[PDB]
């Protein structure tokens, strides 16, 4: 009646183990790990507290691949399986994601104590703003640093920026190799080339100040290059690591820093502060509720979130407008004809009020925006267990939530005929958004309390963009530009570009080119060049 002589086989197949020859240890540190893996996963497919998880033959590695390369297609798949709540590995992290306007409820209106969106974020961007802002500090913080910034993005700001980054539009057509107006009456261009340069030199110019605009002149735009690089998915799994790449970001995020604290204290010295800029704005509404101050290299680091975050969801909105429009003769026509009325044939400056009179002009931005949300998916970190309201899930703490609008935005149940452009689809609602009823204050401004929408472009929650009215005055004065000035259409053969989903913004896939020609063959732009 002997369990014993079991008990030393145990010992002994244990030492028969480690004394296999290392041809079959290698094997079995990877067979074992994988078929350790597929036992796992069948276990946990029996599991009615949880929701179905993707299969993965790959350990780690998740799902990761499909989901990088076409998560909307991937998706749609899971859906089709599992309905509207699923999980999936990615690369060391659980992921469950809830599809639809549910979704939206779930997540982005998630009470404080049960996510957080810093702990999924710090890694991806601390690195390249800086230490003291946006992911890396608390949640508190973050929520009067958007009230800062929000104080800035005033409608009497956006009636100065509006003739500055007209200004600065014009100076692109006139100087930049990719046009020159004054001496050539047609060209090509690629829209990822000229987008992120127009959208830099006008976000410089109005929430930086013509210092840091003038800077652009010099090799100090090199840079804005160098940081730009850093900012990039990879910085999820590898944040730092001693390569060249990282060095230049690190660089570039100390010398850019230090010439805004530069400018900062320079004004400081000299009492020069009034309400230009975004920085003399920051300077003067910068203290926190417990009466600390944020400092110089904190306001610097703000400037460099804020811009940096701006430059690559607008830089892509403005390329995916541009590459619809090229295949869409008659919604130019029909824009150009709104310019006419709104600015009298032209003989009528652009304002920030006249804007606001140029419904399809909005309507082109608002559905740019539905086809082509710049971010596919935002996260959470679960902090506590989560029960998910009418199911038997429990997102336990660890996991991470996904939710995905564009997704939504993109599905014919909430969009007839949701795969083709149509800015008709919001004649009588052209407002960038909306609260469809009550509203609620998380510290930077009343938002919208619901969630349900099933089109959400700047997200919602305490997590909700601060940036929309700036990126549409923004993107209406460029458009009003580009539409008085220029035709564009298509190189023979070429169409849409499909989005690049690796890249921090659903940017698209390049080269992404189009042709444009003047309207006025004759017009010059003036000033000094
Ligand atoms: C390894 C194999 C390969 C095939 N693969 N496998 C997986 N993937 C992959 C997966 C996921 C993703 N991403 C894309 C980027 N994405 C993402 C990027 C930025 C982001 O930002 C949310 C927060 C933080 O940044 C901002 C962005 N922003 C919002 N408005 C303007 N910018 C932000 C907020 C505030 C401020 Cl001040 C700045 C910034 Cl940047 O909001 C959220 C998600 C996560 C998924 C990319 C590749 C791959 O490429
Ligand atoms: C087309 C332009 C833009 C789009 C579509 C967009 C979209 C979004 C979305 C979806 C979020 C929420 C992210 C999340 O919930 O995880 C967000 C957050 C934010 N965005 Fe934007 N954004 C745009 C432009 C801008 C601009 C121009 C600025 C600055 C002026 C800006 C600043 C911010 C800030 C400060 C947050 C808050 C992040 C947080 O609270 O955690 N965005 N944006």
Redesign the pocket.
Known sequence: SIVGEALEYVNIGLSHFLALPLAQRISLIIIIPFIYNIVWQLLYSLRKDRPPLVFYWIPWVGSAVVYGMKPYEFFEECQKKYGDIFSFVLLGRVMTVYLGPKGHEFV?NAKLADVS?EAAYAHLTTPVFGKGV?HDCPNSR?MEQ?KF?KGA?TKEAFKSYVPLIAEEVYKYFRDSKNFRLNERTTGTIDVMVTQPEMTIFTASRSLLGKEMRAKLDTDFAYLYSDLDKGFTPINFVFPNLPLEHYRKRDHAQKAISGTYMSLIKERRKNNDIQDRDLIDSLMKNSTYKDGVKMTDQEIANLLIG?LM??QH??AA?SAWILLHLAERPDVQQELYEEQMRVLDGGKKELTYDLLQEMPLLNQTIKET?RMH???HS??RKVMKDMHVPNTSYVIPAGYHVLVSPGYTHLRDEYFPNAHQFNIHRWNNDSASSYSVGEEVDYGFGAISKGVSSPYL???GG???????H??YCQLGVLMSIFIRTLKWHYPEGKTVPPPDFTSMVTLPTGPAKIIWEKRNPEQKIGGRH
């Not at 305490?462 to 929309?468: D, N, P, Q, T």
Request: proline share 6%; hydrophobic share 50%.
């Open positions: 982005f969106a946006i973050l958007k910034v993005l804020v975050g701006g969801t607008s909105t925006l949300h710049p971010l935002l996260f472009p700047f997200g305490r997590h909700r963009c601060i940036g929309e700036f990126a």
